Structure formats: C-alpha cells, structure tokens
Design a protein around this ligand. Structure first.
Ligand SMILES: OC[C@H]1O[C@H](O[C@H]2[C@H](O)[C@@H](O)[C@@H](O[C@H]3[C@H](O)[C@@H](O)[C@@H](O[C@H]4[C@H](O)[C@@H](O)[C@@H](O)O[C@@H]4CO)O[C@@H]3CO)O[C@@H]2CO)[C@H](O)[C@@H](O)[C@@H]1O
Length: 370
C-alpha cells in the first residue's frame, strides 16, 4: 500500500497540524506532490502496527522517547545529513535521536512543562509545592482553586515524583541499566504521597484530565495549571492575563520534568524517502517552515539555531528553557513505553484510593523490571 508520489504525515492532535499543513501546501506548490497531514488518535501505538504491514505514513512525528522502540523493530530509515545541516541544529538534540550510534529522526523542538498562572488572580506564583494547600484554601473562599492539571497522564505528574529523587532508568556507562529503576525509592514515594494528600484533602480531584484542566484555567476558575507550549495558543484566545514560569520546588529541590524532543522519522517502508528528506530539511526545518507551525500551536524552544535565536527573547521560551535545564532528557530506549504504562497505572490507582502509594509504586517497579 506504498502508493508513491505523495507524502502522508502523522502528527499528534495537540500539535500545530494546520500550520504543518501550510508548509505542506507550499512544498506542493513548487514541487507538485501533495502532502496530507493527519492526526490519528493513538498514532504512536498504531504506527508499529500498520508500518509493520509495510503501510502507514511516510513521516511520523512524536517525542523521541518512542523512537528507540520503533528503530529496534526496524521501522525507521537511517537519516543522512551533511555536517553543514547538522551544524544548523543544537548538538544535544541529535544525541536524543541517536539509537545504537545511528540517527533515526530529525529533531524539531525541545519540550518541557512549565507552571502557567493567571496574573490577575495571582500576581506572584508560589515558589514551593508545600505552599499550595494554603493557597488553595484562600482561593476556595472566593470560589476559585489554586491548581488543576491533567492527572491521567504520568508525563504531567513526573516532575513532582522525580523532584526528591525518583528516576526512570539509571544511566551507567553509556548505557541505561534497565534493571535499575527508581520509581519506588523514597524520593518517588515522597512525591506521590504529596499529590495524593492534595486529593485526600480536596485540593484537587482524582478525575481531572487534560480537557477539564484546560477549561478550568481558561475560564479563570483555577489560578494555575501545568502544561507545555502547545497549550499557549488556547490561552491567548481566552485573553487570560497569564505568565509562564519555573515549576515549584518540592522539599527544597527543583521539579524535574522529562524533556521531550519533538522528532520526525521516515518510515523504512516508504517509497518516498527522498521526497521526505527534501520536505523536512529544505521546507520544514527552515525559519519559514518552523514559524508557520509555531503560529498554529507554539513548538517550544526549537532545534534550529537561527529561529531559536529569534524565539529566545520571549519570556515564555525562557521559562521553558529554565524548566528543561532542571529536568532530564528522556531515554529513547524501547523500555520507555513499558516504564510509562506502569507508572500511569500506579498514579491513577494511588490517586483514586484503589491502592496505597507504597503498593502502587512497588507493583510498577516489579512490572518494569519484569
Ligand atoms: O494505556 C492507555 C493509554 O496508552 C497510550 O499512551 C501511552 C503512550 O502510547 C506511550 O508513548 C507513553 O506516552 C508518553 C509519551 O511517549 C511521552 O512523549 C509523553 O507524551 C507527551 C508529549 O511528549 C508531549 O508533546 C504532549 O503531547 O504530551 C504528551 C503527554 O500527554 O508522555 C506520555 C506519558 O504521559 O505512555 C502512554 C501511557 O501513559 C494512549 O495514547 C493513551 O491515549 C492511553 O491513555
């Protein structure tokens, strides 16, 4: 089901697909081949399924953490750029899309969660997690709340779990040791207990998801939320007077978000590798290609140095870079998806009272290490 002569791109629904569509149109305008951009639900799970058949998109966008597993299944072409092109992007973004010494994708953007706050309702954001219960009780007196964020997805809670010492896989020599997993140590247990105490004492609800939290913030019902740059767009249309700052510390330690590098990989089963390379290197990864996407939903701190130089004056980009620096670049090993599924279950079970914190995280460590 090759087709040929066209490009099909999958990208997640939260990202600037309509912008990327613009960039596709221009490529189609001066090259003649059509580019259809789609955003299937559950594309990152679908990809290893369809592309296994020899079908699916020519180009697949997702954070880099999924890209080791795809590479291990031989689903991605090795990419090949001259030293000149490589010099156009930041080096650490290349490291993230290397699997077994090979490059498996092009880096586009560096993503890190920030604290987003309603300046009108809250001139100074808290410096610490510990001062959030008190802040909530003040605000509830006026029918507002302190903080709502998506609790269904472990990506949003990880920064608190990691803060006092939790980790995914220990980095040994050049390897991650997949048997040394830090989701059940004292640091992780401290962080998840805190969150669970926030819910027990009605400072937020176990059921809050991405939509609930986004609506509460953008209507001015909650003073704070935790999200990444793709969310800024929807806030601007609400005209809420917002700032974007460092995440609060916990026990004196910085919150530590897992940093994701938005990457684009070429399906090894594509009859269109050359057209794919062309589109990416010469259309998308230019100041003009990147701004068209950014205009639709912001990318974050972008991998292309020339555009980042223009973006870096923005205090939002500055905050994004400050949280990224306190955080850690995710592994891209195949075991990352196993990690995520276990942790997701642990958080949801702990937050809902189905399990104690200690039970939840012990299960997760057992599930991850086999
Ligand atoms: O089991 C039901 C759930 O399973 C599916 O979600 C899985 C994904 O398949 C895994 O890849 C992983 O997801 C990670 C993701 O790989 C990682 O990048 C990060 O995702 C960010 C993204 O970087 C960022 O750009 C923005 O889009 O937000 C994403 C988080 O929403 O974190 C994810 C973990 O939160 O793990 C999940 C299970 O957690 C399926 O897609 C789900 O819809 C389903 O709930």
């Amino acid at each position: 089901k090759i087709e040929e002569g066209k490009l099909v791109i999958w990208i997640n629904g939260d990202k600037g697909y309509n912008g990327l569509a613009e960039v596709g149109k221009k490529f189609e305008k001066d090259t003649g081949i059509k580019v259809t951009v789609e955003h299937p639900d559950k594309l990152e799970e679908k990809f290893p399924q369809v592309a296994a058949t020899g079908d699916g998109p020519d180009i697949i966008f997702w954070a880099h953490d999924r890209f080791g597993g795809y590479a291990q299944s031989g689903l991605l072409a090795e990419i090949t750029p001259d030293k000149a092109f490589q010099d156009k992007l930041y080096p650490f973004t290349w490291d993230a899309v290397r699997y077994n010494g090979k490059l498996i994708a092009y880096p586009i953007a560096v993503e890190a969660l920030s604290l987003i706050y309603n300046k009108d309702l809250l001139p100074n954001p808290p410096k610490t997690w510990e001062e959030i219960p008190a802040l909530d009780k003040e605000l509830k007196a006026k029918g507002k709340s302190a903080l709502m964020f998506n609790l269904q997805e472990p990506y949003f809670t990880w920064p608190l779990i990691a803060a006092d010492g939790g980790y995914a896989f220990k980095y040994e020599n050049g390897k991650y040791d997949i048997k040394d997993v830090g989701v059940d140590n004292a640091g992780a247990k401290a962080g998840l207990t805190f969150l669970v105490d926030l819910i027990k004492n009605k400072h937020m609800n176990a059921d809050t998801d991405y939509s609930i939290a986004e609506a509460a913030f953008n209507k001015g019902e909650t003073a704070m939320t935790i999200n990444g740059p793709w969310a800024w767009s929807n806030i601007d249309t609400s005209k809420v007077n917002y700032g974007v700052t460092v995440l609060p510390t916990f026990k004196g330690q910085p919150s530590k978000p897992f940093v994701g590098v938005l990457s684009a990989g070429i399906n090894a089963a594509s009859p269109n590798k050359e057209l794919a390379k062309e589109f990416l290197e010469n259309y998308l990864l230019t100041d003009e290609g990147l701004e068209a996407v950014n205009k639709d939903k912001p990318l974050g701190a972008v991998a292309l140095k020339s555009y980042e130089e223009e973006l870096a004056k923005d205090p939002r980009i500055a905050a994004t870079m400050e949280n990224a620096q306190k955080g850690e670049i995710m592994p891209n090993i195949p075991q990352m998806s196993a990690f995520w599924y276990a942790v997701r279950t642990a958080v949801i079970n702990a937050a809902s009272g189905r399990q104690t914190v200690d039970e939840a995280l012990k299960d997760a460590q057992t599930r991850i290490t086999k």
